[PDB]
């Protein structure tokens, strides 16, 4: 597998339970202790073939999991990824981001953004508690692809208990069901102006304020409802 | 005489036009510049005889002039002046100060503070002027005691010119008669209440505005309405 180093506990915890061998993908990460991404060098087959090679009892990778977005809200330019990594399953271990297709903003910055990609099945296990409006330990697993469906249905029934809790089912799927319609684009967007209009007065605070203050750690010039890029001709960052 | 150090270019001329002999006060200053006050050990009689001994051609002095106050404004504490220092006539240069009667903020801060001292005679000579509202080379003469009435007349018969500026003469009374009645005090009392006030917000905006400002040399807690003495407790001044 090509398990991003940026990764939870439970994919630990995978790897011990099952007789598998990784390759580590390397993020980077700034002086704060931001954990930043993996390069786009780490995703070709250049990179990935030397990393198989020095590694021992290692094969070519069927599988790979990237933790998309990181723990402080970094998204991929994944159709870089799903165009350029030549393995035939990519999971997005979307934990943090689970309110992706709900906004425009997020176009091209998850799993199931834009087509069936040819060749390969792609994951994301959106945890829909933690963004979202749901019950904990409430998760889902979106796929997007050709999976075999008896043995994939078996893996899921492998994993997950025979008697659930139906208030967090009932939990997870009404918490789909608050985003559709206008009510649901109106709570998205609400949160994303209401976010951006608080970085505006902190940096505004900031440069009010005698002394110190709180700074956020942001591009220095933010007025549009969009993912700002992390530029390299800027600082910030 | 004994001339301060803090004066004027105007007593510089007259000693030169005068056969006089001076012992030069020692006023104190802060390392901004501003000239501060003669301390208090300077107009007593065992300072003043040494000085008076160590100057050649010297005897004990028949005049003092006082510039009360500064050009920063520090008035002094001017019936420690009138009652210790022991000449026959103590002349108060005050220039900068000659709205002194017209609020009891500045009681005891003048040469016609209190009574009429016994013994020496008191002259003030306001520079009407300055920060009253007349035209200028209007000034004043005020004694407190008495004087050879033909002699001091013709004195001043000396300096002044025979034909002068009616205007200026109308001004310099009319300035006395905007402080006749109700609207003299209210001007002199808004005017320092107006001052204060000033001098609160720069102090506000000092701590309201980020990284440096302009500072205002004045006591850390000023609310009140009087001259706020410089005490030895205190480092502002």
């Given at each position: 597998?090509?398990?991003?180093?940026?990764?939870?506990?439970?994919?630990?915890?995978?790897?011990?339970?099952?007789?598998?061998?990784?390759?580590?993908?390397?993020?980077?990460?700034?002086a704060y202790g931001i954990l930043g991404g993996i390069p786009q060098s780490e995703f070709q087959h250049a990179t990935i073939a030397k990393r198989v090679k020095e590694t021992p009892n290692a094969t070519w990778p069927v599988h790979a999991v990237i933790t998309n977005s990181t723990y402080d809200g970094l998204l991929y330019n994944t159709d870089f990824i799903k165009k350029t990594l030549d393995v035939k399953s990519i999971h997005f271990d979307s934990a943090w981001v689970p309110y992706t297709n709900f906004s425009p903003i997020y176009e091209g910055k998850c799993g199931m953004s834009g087509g069936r990609v040819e060749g390969k099945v792609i994951y994301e296990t959106q945890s829909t508690h933690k963004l979202l409006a749901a019950f904990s330990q409430a998760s889902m697993i979106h796929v997007k692809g050709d999976v075999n469906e008896e043995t994939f249905n078996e893996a899921y029934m492998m994993h997950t208990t025979t008697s659930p809790?139906?208030?967090?089912?009932?939990?997870?799927?009404?918490?789909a069901a608050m985003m559709k319609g206008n009510a649901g684009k109106r709570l998205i967007n609400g949160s994303i102006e209401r976010a951006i209009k608080f970085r505006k007065e902190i940096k505004r605070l900031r440069t009010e304020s005698d002394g110190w203050f709180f700074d956020v750690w942001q591009p220095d010039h933010i007025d549009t409802t969009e993912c700002w890029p992390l530029r390299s001709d800027s600082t910030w960052h």
């Amino acid at each position: 597998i090509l398990i991003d180093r940026n990764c939870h506990k439970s994919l630990t915890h995978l790897m011990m339970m099952s007789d598998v061998t990784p390759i580590y993908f390397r993020p980077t990460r700034n002086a704060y202790g931001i954990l930043g991404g993996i390069p786009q060098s780490e995703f070709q087959h250049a990179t990935i073939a030397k990393r198989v090679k020095e590694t021992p009892n290692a094969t070519w990778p069927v599988h790979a999991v990237i933790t998309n977005s990181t723990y402080d809200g970094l998204l991929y330019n994944t159709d870089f990824i799903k165009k350029t990594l030549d393995v035939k399953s990519i999971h997005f271990d979307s934990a943090w981001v689970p309110y992706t297709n709900f906004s425009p903003i997020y176009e091209g910055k998850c799993g199931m953004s834009g087509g069936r990609v040819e060749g390969k099945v792609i994951y994301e296990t959106q945890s829909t508690h933690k963004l979202l409006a749901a019950f904990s330990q409430a998760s889902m697993i979106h796929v997007k692809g050709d999976v075999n469906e008896e043995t994939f249905n078996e893996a899921y029934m492998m994993h997950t208990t025979t008697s659930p809790h139906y208030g967090i089912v009932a939990s997870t799927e009404t918490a789909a069901a608050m985003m559709k319609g206008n009510a649901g684009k109106r709570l998205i967007n609400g949160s994303i102006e209401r976010a951006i209009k608080f970085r505006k007065e902190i940096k505004r605070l900031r440069t009010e304020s005698d002394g110190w203050f709180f700074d956020v750690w942001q591009p220095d010039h933010i007025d549009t409802t969009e993912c700002w890029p992390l530029r390299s001709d800027s600082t910030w960052h």
